[model samples]
Target chain A: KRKKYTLYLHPEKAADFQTLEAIESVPRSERGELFRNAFISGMALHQLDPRLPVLLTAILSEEFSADQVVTLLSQTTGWKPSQADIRAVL
Target chain B: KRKKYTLYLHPEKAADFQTLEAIESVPRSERGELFRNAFISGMALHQLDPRLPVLLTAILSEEFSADQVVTLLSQTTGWKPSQADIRAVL
Candidate 1:
């Protein structure tokens, strides 16, 4: 079954790699400006392949648990500090 | 301000033209089968131009008024009989 998750970027780079690289390179702190895309799509690294726009983000899915949400948040946004840290931002 | 509306299609053609044609050509009655993408993205008819995937759909926005929702519903999904037909499908 399809599960839902969110990643964020301007609609501009819904399909761009340098932008994808920027997404991977920038300190997580700066990502607040762009949110609401799919995480798997963002992290897939498919851009390097000739596939162009292979798999995309989840448009529909469920919320992460208090713990899982933090894990992914820490991993992606750096928005959250750690899975073990307080869920202050969450 | 960013607005949110939904359209639907498989992620495969988030950037394809033939698929855009598919979204437009299929009878509206059949749209229920493929909902969840942004409506503007579906109806824009931009695929004919060399410019592709232009103006991606809103990731966020306000709901249409009871009146407007039905208008779009009839136009897009063919799910409704008319704007004034009934509150049934919405």
Candidate 2:
């Protein structure tokens, strides 16, 4: 089994947990590439917000489309990122 | 003030915290570039170990030389990574 990593958001207002649960849900045999891409995307998303890297670890799952990621992110964080932004990172 | 992020290591045995305290120690005004490179390096380090992204978030600080990072990593994790391996990621 692969080890698990957790990303946390620590803001002055509150503290919260953002898990890579999506990646974890994936079968271990197929997780390597997905995990690599997620971290790479997290690097690109770094420019948008410090919090993005944590969110992306879950959002970049194959189960989620680029449009879905953008829409979901906007809904969750109120940050409207373009679909192209997501695509470019992915 | 900049927002804070935490990276946690969760294993079958126990959970531990690995903070980016080094990045936080830098002045807010100059943190952007450091943060960016750290995440990018984290992406590269993903190939080595999942836990590395978290450690690198702190270890890649300007205060630490590549040699220092390699030594610290080996000492702490018992993983001997060459200075070049660390430099490549940086």
Candidate 3:
């Protein structure tokens, strides 16, 4: 079984960790694409706030309609994500 | 034309911005994968030093052998990235 681990970067230098390489280094798994996509989305979410994507993933995993989730998150995340956009992880 | 914008996260809220969704929202581009990947790696780098991957990307875009760059970076960034890993982004 594979799981996520936190690999910290070293911002001041040239190679704290090769972010692209790190993501690519993971051996292909059954859910590899989304896993990589998850981190890609994870970083985007982290930029907005360090804690959001976690919640988003949690909620998306639930049984909410795209409309309900979109509205709920728009109010909560405050970014007004389009319903179509809501469909990516839905 | 495309550019990276700063989308700060709310941290406390449940849906400040769906990080995963944000990465997916970018309509397919000629170079979208790497562009999205840079940010993914950027976050990983940020967790460590907040300044490393920038240098990595910059140097990676420039002319340098993997070993030379690796040593230069190991001394500077203080992380021992492998030659193979160096090849990924090189």
Tell me the TM-score of each prediction against the true structure: 0.18, 0.25, 0.26
Which portions of model 2 miss their true places by more than 4 Å? Answer: A1-21, A54-90, B1-90
Q: Considering summed lDDT, which 10 consecutive residues are worst modelled in model 1 chain A? A: A43-52
Give the total clashing residue pairs for model 3.
14
* lDDT of the candidates, in the order given: 0.27, 0.37, 0.36
Q: In candidate 3, what are the lDDT values of residues A28-85, reduced to their tens digit?
A: 4622442333344344433444344334333432232223323333444553312222
The two-chain DockQ for each candidate, comma-separated, is 0.02, 0.08, 0.04
The candidate maximizing DockQ is 2
| Top model number, lDDT | 2
Q: Please rank every candidate by DockQ, starting with the best.
A: 2, 3, 1
Error of 2 at B86 (Å): 50
User: For residues B1-86, could you state the per-residue lDDT of candidate 1 as single tens digits?
Assistant: 22222222234433332234434564666443222222211211121111111222221122212233222322433332211213
Interface RMSD of each: 20.1, 15.6, 20.8
Error of 2 at A54 (Å): 5.1
lDDT of 1 at A61: 22
- Please identify model 3 stretches exceeding 4 Å from their true place: A1-30, A57-61, A80-90, B1-90
Note each model's CA RMSD in angstroms: 20.6, 15.9, 21.8
lDDT of 2 at A5: 35
* Fnat across every predicted model, in order: 0.00, 0.12, 0.05
